[PDB]
Amino acid sequence: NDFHRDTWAEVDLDAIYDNVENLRRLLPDDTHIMAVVKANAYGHGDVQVARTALEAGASRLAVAFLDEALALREKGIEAPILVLGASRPADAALAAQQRIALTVFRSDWLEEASALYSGPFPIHFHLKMDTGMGRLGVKDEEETKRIVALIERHPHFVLEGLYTHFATADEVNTDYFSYQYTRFLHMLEWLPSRPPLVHCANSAASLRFPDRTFNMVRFGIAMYGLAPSPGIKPLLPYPLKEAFSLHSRLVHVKKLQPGEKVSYGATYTAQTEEWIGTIPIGYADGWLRRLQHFHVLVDGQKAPIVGRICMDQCMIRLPGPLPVGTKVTLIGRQGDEVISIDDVARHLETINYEVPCTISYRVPRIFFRHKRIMEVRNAIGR
Amino acid sequence: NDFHRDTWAEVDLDAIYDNVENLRRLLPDDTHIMAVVKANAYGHGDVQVARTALEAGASRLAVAFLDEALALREKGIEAPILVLGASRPADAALAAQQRIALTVFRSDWLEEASALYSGPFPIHFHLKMDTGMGRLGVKDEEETKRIVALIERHPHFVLEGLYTHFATADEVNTDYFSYQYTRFLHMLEWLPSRPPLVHCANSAASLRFPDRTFNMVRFGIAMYGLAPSPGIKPLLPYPLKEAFSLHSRLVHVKKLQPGEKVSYGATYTAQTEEWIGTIPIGYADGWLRRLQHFHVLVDGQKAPIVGRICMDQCMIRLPGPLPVGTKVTLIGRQGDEVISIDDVARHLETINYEVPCTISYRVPRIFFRHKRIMEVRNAI
Numbered sequence A: 001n002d003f004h005r006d007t008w009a010e011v012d013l014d015a016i017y018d019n020v021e022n023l024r025r026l027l028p029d030d031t032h033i034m035a036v037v038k039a040n041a042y043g044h045g046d047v048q049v050a051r052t053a054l055e056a057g058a059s060r061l062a063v064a065f066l067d068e069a070l071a072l073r074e075k076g077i078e079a080p081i082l083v084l085g086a087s088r089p090a091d092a093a094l095a096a097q098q099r100i101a102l103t104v105f106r107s108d109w110l111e112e113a114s115a116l117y118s119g120p121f122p123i124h125f126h127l128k129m130d131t132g133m134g135r136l137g138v139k140d141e142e143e144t145k146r147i148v149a150l151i152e153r154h155p156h157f158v159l160e161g162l163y164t165h166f167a168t169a170d171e172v173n174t175d176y177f178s179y180q181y182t183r184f185l186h187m188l189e190w191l192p193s194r195p196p197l198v199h200c201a202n203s204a205a206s207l208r209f210p211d212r213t214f215n216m217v218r219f220g221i222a223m224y225g226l227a228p229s230p231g232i233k234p235l236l237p238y239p240l241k242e243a244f245s246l247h248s249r250l251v252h253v254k255k256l257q258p259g260e261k262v263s264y265g266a267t268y269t270a271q272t273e274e275w276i277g278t279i280p281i282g283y284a285d286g287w288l289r290r291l292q293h294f295h296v297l298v299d300g301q302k303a304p305i306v307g308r309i310c311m312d313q314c315m316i317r318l319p320g321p322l323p324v325g326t327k328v329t330l331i332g333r334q335g336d337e338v339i340s341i342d343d344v345a346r347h348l349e350t351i352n353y354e355v356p357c358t359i360s361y362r363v364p365r366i367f368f369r370h371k372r373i374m375e376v377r378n379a380i381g382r
Numbered sequence B: 001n002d003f004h005r006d007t008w009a010e011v012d013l014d015a016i017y018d019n020v021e022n023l024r025r026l027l028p029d030d031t032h033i034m035a036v037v038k039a040n041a042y043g044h045g046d047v048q049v050a051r052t053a054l055e056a057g058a059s060r061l062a063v064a065f066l067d068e069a070l071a072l073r074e075k076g077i078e079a080p081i082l083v084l085g086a087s088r089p090a091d092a093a094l095a096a097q098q099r100i101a102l103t104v105f106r107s108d109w110l111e112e113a114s115a116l117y118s119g120p121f122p123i124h125f126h127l128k129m130d131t132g133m134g135r136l137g138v139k140d141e142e143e144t145k146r147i148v149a150l151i152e153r154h155p156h157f158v159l160e161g162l163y164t165h166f167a168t169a170d171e172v173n174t175d176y177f178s179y180q181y182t183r184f185l186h187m188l189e190w191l192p193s194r195p196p197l198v199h200c201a202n203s204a205a206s207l208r209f210p211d212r213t214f215n216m217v218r219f220g221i222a223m224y225g226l227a228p229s230p231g232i233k234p235l236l237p238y239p240l241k242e243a244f245s246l247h248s249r250l251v252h253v254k255k256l257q258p259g260e261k262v263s264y265g266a267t268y269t270a271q272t273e274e275w276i277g278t279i280p281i282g283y284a285d286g287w288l289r290r291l292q293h294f295h296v297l298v299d300g301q302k303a304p305i306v307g308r309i310c311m312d313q314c315m316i317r318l319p320g321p322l323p324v325g326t327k328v329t330l331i332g333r334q335g336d337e338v339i340s341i342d343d344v345a346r347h348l349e350t351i352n353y354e355v356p357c358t359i360s361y362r363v364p365r366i367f368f369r370h371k372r373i374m375e376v377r378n379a380i
């Protein structure tokens, strides 16, 4: 595959192998790893991360909605997929044919699905319990038993799992974590029998309490080498290896004289004789406007973004006359200097999760494995 | 195509047609309209919008970089396409074979392209002049002459046009605008012969000063029905129709009791007996975390997003117990109420331009033309 703009993101798949393998070492050999690759593997490339994770020790995959699971099947993944979120009952059939397990949290959904499906393939369900997150999930004993019955009655419906999700697993103070864990324990007793897969843990829960995970963990953010929160970094068992880096190249260089304005709304004004560089990356690439007072790396050095950010390009003050074609690093290392997703996140006033996800389809992903390029994936490619 | 999650964007091509045909009316017969369709047509759909604009009166298209243009060509667009940004000298042969015009602003670029490309297709260049924007463009006299000379001298290189871009055309205060306009008029004299296409205007200068736009207007944001700035709204010649809306549906509804927490970090506490709904849209869909205190529309009413926004889901405080499947409009109209892109931008502390652009590949676009559903585009 190929690309024709000098702006690309690199994803280091060796880092992803290490982060997942270290977890397979840490967890009890009877506890499986469900790798979660929702949102195009948190902006990193769904099938590439999925293949790598399954190599390091993962056995299942998790996604947010049905289209994401089907897209993984089209690209040849044959591992089990759990759709963590909601789906349409009319689609139960397609999920069953493609061997995608579904999350269920309401009986009216199952009432509606028994009526539209009658084999031959089984649909594996994972009942979702709301123990304190307030998002999806059952919250009552009458409703938990109803779902279980409706599932028991249809011959093709199977309860493969049961889970919950924590709202504050990434907080140093485990008070709400404890209420939720204890609540899941009391909620599990409302089921006639324990299904084979009981899971609760995300990355913050499984890296902190490996012994409290039951038999399957749903490992997300830590797979990509990003800490669940800057509150648990010291509490982490093994070092995490960041996989994502973003880069560009200078396409225009010029010296300004004192008094000349730069970019929209002509915000910036040069005060001495300065060299301004232009890079082909802007807000439609996910390098949002709020980053206008941030900096990028050019030739091992920090250089500020100057003026407002444009849709496809932005300007930066250079140390002096640098050549056109000089690599600029937006996220990554250049020498002794480094800009991490947490740094971008801080400036954007968000969590690290939101950063790779916003780097758009427009920006190509180059995959590295065994310190060499494995494939290029340009979404608007030929 | 089709999609399997109840979150979708709707693009109204009729709005997009009217915004273009009205400028086609307001501009001279001589003057072309170049529809700017970069960034997947500002998040509205590249082919769908390109096609609609050409039907409405546009004769040319513009894109940001080479991959966006090759993508239009692969989808059947055979109308002219200018790449407004930069490209590699080594890709001038590809641009040529696919009939894509390129922006030029540096002499060393040409020198390099001249070594690498010998023919047989011609390559049409548009000389960019920097008159005050500081982004791309030639600034000095002898750099202009050197470009003209390197173009004149090569058998397959043609200078089809030249242009500039205004930094403050959306600004009420036209003082930097008139400095740029004057600088341009002056730089045009460093050229022996004035080329066939001279263009300077973005949407704002083309709707504000249609006569002082020469023979080609680049038309962007306003095509999508969005004003260039809040300051320019009551100075525009016709009403713009808004093309983009975003919808979702309730997938869970629950009554929460007081002292009960909602979402990450448990930062929302239920104070009364509240009905809470979950919708399948979140920050990976471009509905950013910062929209946490914002109002969406459910059943004709504003309803707040309560608790933190998740990757793929978020929660809202419902007026009462509504059925699962109820349509929630995040951008758009629900009876009596409207949320515009300008509203979303206000809360995210940005400009409208940024909004449809971040609504991600994950969100299908349903297109309407002639008041009927034309097409569904689902990226994954």
Ligand SMILES: Cc1ncc(COP(=O)(O)O)c(CNC2CONC2=O)c1O
Binding pocket: A036, A084, A165, A201, A202, A203, A204, A218, A219, A220, A221, A222, A228, A353, B309, B310, B311, B312, B313
């Ligand atoms: C049910 C479920 N389990 C596991 C994960 C992944 O856990 P980590 O990526 O923290 O290791 C997610 C991601 N859900 C997200 C991610 O961000 N916001 C959300 O609601 C999820 O929804």
Ligand SMILES: Cc1ncc(COP(=O)(O)O)c(CNC2CONC2=O)c1O
Binding pocket: A309, A310, A311, A312, A313, B036, B084, B165, B201, B202, B203, B204, B218, B219, B220, B221, B222, B228, B353
């Ligand atoms: C050269 C050029 N012409 C026309 C347009 C579109 O004009 P409007 O969208 O204002 O009607 C742009 C968008 N350039 C942008 C947009 O945002 N940041 C940029 O650098 C452009 O770069």
